[PDB]
Scaffold this motif. Structure first.
Motif, PDB file in Angstrom:
ATOM      1  N   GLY A   1       0.787  -1.339   0.036  1.00 25.78           N
ATOM      2  CA  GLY A   1       0.059  -0.006   0.078  1.00 25.78           C
ATOM      3  C   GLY A   1       0.843   1.200   0.144  1.00 25.78           C
ATOM      4  O   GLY A   1       2.017   1.149  -0.088  1.00 25.78           O
ATOM      5  N   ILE A   2       0.188   2.361   0.055  1.00 25.07           N
ATOM      6  CA  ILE A   2       1.006   3.756   0.182  1.00 25.07           C
ATOM      7  C   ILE A   2       1.954   3.726   1.110  1.00 25.07           C
ATOM      8  O   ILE A   2       3.007   4.585   1.005  1.00 25.07           O
ATOM      9  CB  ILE A   2      -0.053   4.950   0.438  1.00 25.07           C
ATOM     10  N   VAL A   3       1.787   3.274   2.391  1.00 26.05           N
ATOM     11  CA  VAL A   3       2.785   3.368   3.508  1.00 26.05           C
ATOM     12  C   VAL A   3       4.194   2.631   3.072  1.00 26.05           C
ATOM     13  O   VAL A   3       5.081   3.310   3.068  1.00 26.05           O
ATOM     14  CB  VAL A   3       2.184   3.045   4.749  1.00 26.05           C
ATOM     15  N   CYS A   6       5.536   5.008   0.215  1.00 21.98           N
ATOM     16  CA  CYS A   6       5.935   6.487   0.235  1.00 21.98           C
ATOM     17  C   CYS A   6       6.406   6.621   1.664  1.00 21.98           C
ATOM     18  O   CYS A   6       7.282   7.715   1.612  1.00 21.98           O
ATOM     19  CB  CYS A   6       4.670   7.137  -0.009  1.00 21.98           C
ATOM     20  N   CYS A   7       6.322   5.902   2.701  1.00 20.24           N
ATOM     21  CA  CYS A   7       6.651   6.097   3.984  1.00 20.24           C
ATOM     22  C   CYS A   7       7.943   5.216   4.077  1.00 20.24           C
ATOM     23  O   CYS A   7       8.991   5.702   4.451  1.00 20.24           O
ATOM     24  CB  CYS A   7       5.664   5.749   4.951  1.00 20.24           C
ATOM     25  N   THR A   8       8.106   4.146   4.122  1.00 20.90           N
ATOM     26  CA  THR A   8       9.020   2.823   4.297  1.00 20.90           C
ATOM     27  C   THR A   8      10.144   3.246   3.161  1.00 20.90           C
ATOM     28  O   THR A   8      11.317   2.953   3.444  1.00 20.90           O
ATOM     29  CB  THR A   8       8.661   1.451   4.578  1.00 20.90           C
ATOM     30  N   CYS A  11       9.022   8.129  -1.749  1.00 20.13           N
ATOM     31  CA  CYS A  11       7.676   8.515  -2.472  1.00 20.13           C
ATOM     32  C   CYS A  11       8.005   8.871  -3.837  1.00 20.13           C
ATOM     33  O   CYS A  11       9.262   9.161  -4.283  1.00 20.13           O
ATOM     34  CB  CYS A  11       6.637   9.254  -1.542  1.00 20.13           C
ATOM     35  N   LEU A  16       1.752   8.886  -5.900  1.00 20.22           N
ATOM     36  CA  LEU A  16       0.834   9.678  -4.922  1.00 20.22           C
ATOM     37  C   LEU A  16      -0.595   9.466  -5.995  1.00 20.22           C
ATOM     38  O   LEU A  16      -1.534   9.536  -5.175  1.00 20.22           O
ATOM     39  CB  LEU A  16       1.426  10.876  -4.678  1.00 20.22           C
ATOM     40  N   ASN A  18      -1.805   7.619  -7.769  1.00 21.14           N
ATOM     41  CA  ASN A  18      -2.452   6.211  -7.742  1.00 21.14           C
ATOM     42  C   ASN A  18      -3.512   6.460  -6.603  1.00 21.14           C
ATOM     43  O   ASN A  18      -4.555   5.787  -6.761  1.00 21.14           O
ATOM     44  CB  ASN A  18      -1.510   5.217  -7.403  1.00 21.14           C
ATOM     45  N   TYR A  19      -3.402   7.400  -5.940  1.00 24.43           N
ATOM     46  CA  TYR A  19      -4.403   7.386  -4.807  1.00 24.43           C
ATOM     47  C   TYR A  19      -5.490   8.438  -4.849  1.00 24.43           C
ATOM     48  O   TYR A  19      -6.150   8.961  -3.655  1.00 24.43           O
ATOM     49  CB  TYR A  19      -3.700   7.324  -3.389  1.00 24.43           C
TER      50      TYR A  19
ATOM     51  N   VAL B   2       7.647  15.968  -2.449  1.00 23.87           N
ATOM     52  CA  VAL B   2       7.158  14.686  -3.114  1.00 23.87           C
ATOM     53  C   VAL B   2       8.119  13.471  -2.926  1.00 23.87           C
ATOM     54  O   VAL B   2       7.778  12.467  -2.419  1.00 23.87           O
ATOM     55  CB  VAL B   2       6.404  14.593  -4.275  1.00 23.87           C
ATOM     56  N   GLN B   4      10.581  11.814  -1.144  1.00 26.08           N
ATOM     57  CA  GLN B   4      11.195  11.581   0.080  1.00 26.08           C
ATOM     58  C   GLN B   4      10.159  10.757   0.882  1.00 26.08           C
ATOM     59  O   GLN B   4       9.278  10.214   0.202  1.00 26.08           O
ATOM     60  CB  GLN B   4      11.244  13.007   0.831  1.00 26.08           C
ATOM     61  N   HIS B   5      10.646  10.193   1.861  1.00 26.11           N
ATOM     62  CA  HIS B   5       9.969   9.531   2.902  1.00 26.11           C
ATOM     63  C   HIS B   5       8.897  10.282   3.476  1.00 26.11           C
ATOM     64  O   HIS B   5       9.150  11.209   4.102  1.00 26.11           O
ATOM     65  CB  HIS B   5      10.815   8.732   4.037  1.00 26.11           C
ATOM     66  N   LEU B   6       7.382  10.036   3.122  1.00 24.56           N
ATOM     67  CA  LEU B   6       6.384  10.871   3.754  1.00 24.56           C
ATOM     68  C   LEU B   6       5.478   9.728   4.609  1.00 24.56           C
ATOM     69  O   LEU B   6       4.944   8.814   4.177  1.00 24.56           O
ATOM     70  CB  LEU B   6       5.507  11.372   2.353  1.00 24.56           C
ATOM     71  N   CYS B   7       5.629  10.075   5.784  1.00 22.32           N
ATOM     72  CA  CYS B   7       4.918   9.014   6.808  1.00 22.32           C
ATOM     73  C   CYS B   7       3.824  10.164   7.653  1.00 22.32           C
ATOM     74  O   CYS B   7       3.958  11.297   7.951  1.00 22.32           O
ATOM     75  CB  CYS B   7       5.658   8.682   7.695  1.00 22.32           C
ATOM     76  N   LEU B  15      -0.818  14.307  -0.040  1.00 19.48           N
ATOM     77  CA  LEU B  15      -1.820  13.803  -1.146  1.00 19.48           C
ATOM     78  C   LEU B  15      -2.661  14.739  -1.399  1.00 19.48           C
ATOM     79  O   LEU B  15      -3.251  15.005  -2.418  1.00 19.48           O
ATOM     80  CB  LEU B  15      -2.659  12.650  -0.392  1.00 19.48           C
ATOM     81  N   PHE B  25      -7.709   9.039  -1.002  1.00 16.79           N
ATOM     82  CA  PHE B  25      -8.087   8.150  -0.232  1.00 16.79           C
ATOM     83  C   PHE B  25      -6.930   7.650   0.512  1.00 16.79           C
ATOM     84  O   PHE B  25      -5.750   7.559  -0.097  1.00 16.79           O
ATOM     85  CB  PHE B  25      -8.974   6.761  -0.547  1.00 16.79           C
ATOM     86  N   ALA B  30      -3.212  -1.402   4.406  1.00 14.51           N
ATOM     87  CA  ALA B  30      -3.862  -2.202   3.216  1.00 14.51           C
ATOM     88  C   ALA B  30      -3.969  -3.419   2.877  1.00 14.51           C
ATOM     89  O   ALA B  30      -3.108  -3.996   1.987  1.00 14.51           O
ATOM     90  CB  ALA B  30      -2.954  -1.318   1.910  1.00 14.51           C
TER      91      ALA B  30
END
Lengths: 21, 30
Positions: A1-3, A6-8, A11, A16, A18-19, B2, B4-7, B15, B25, B30
Motif C-alpha cells: 500500500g501507500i505506506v 511512500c513512507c518506508t 515516495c 501518489l 494512484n491514490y 514529494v 522523500q519518505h512521507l509518513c 496527497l 483516499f 492496506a
C-alpha cells in the motif's frame, strides 16, 4: 500500500496520484 | 516535497496538495 511505497521507501508523484480519486 | 519518505500527517498533506479537488483516499493498513 501507500505506506510501503511512500513512507518506508521513497515516495514519487507517480505513486501518489494512484491514490487520488 | 514529494520525493522523500512521507509518513503520517506528512504523507496526508502531500496527497492533499497533489490530488487537489479530486480528493484522495488514505489507507494505512492496506
Amino acid at each position: 500500500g501507500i505506506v510501503e511505497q511512500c513512507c518506508t521507501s521513497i515516495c514519487s508523484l507517480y505513486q501518489l496520484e494512484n491514490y487520488c480519486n | 516535497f514529494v520525493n522523500q519518505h512521507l509518513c503520517g500527517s506528512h504523507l496526508v498533506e502531500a496527497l492533499y496538495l497533489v490530488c487537489g479537488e479530486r480528493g484522495f483516499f488514505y489507507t494505512p493498513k492496506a
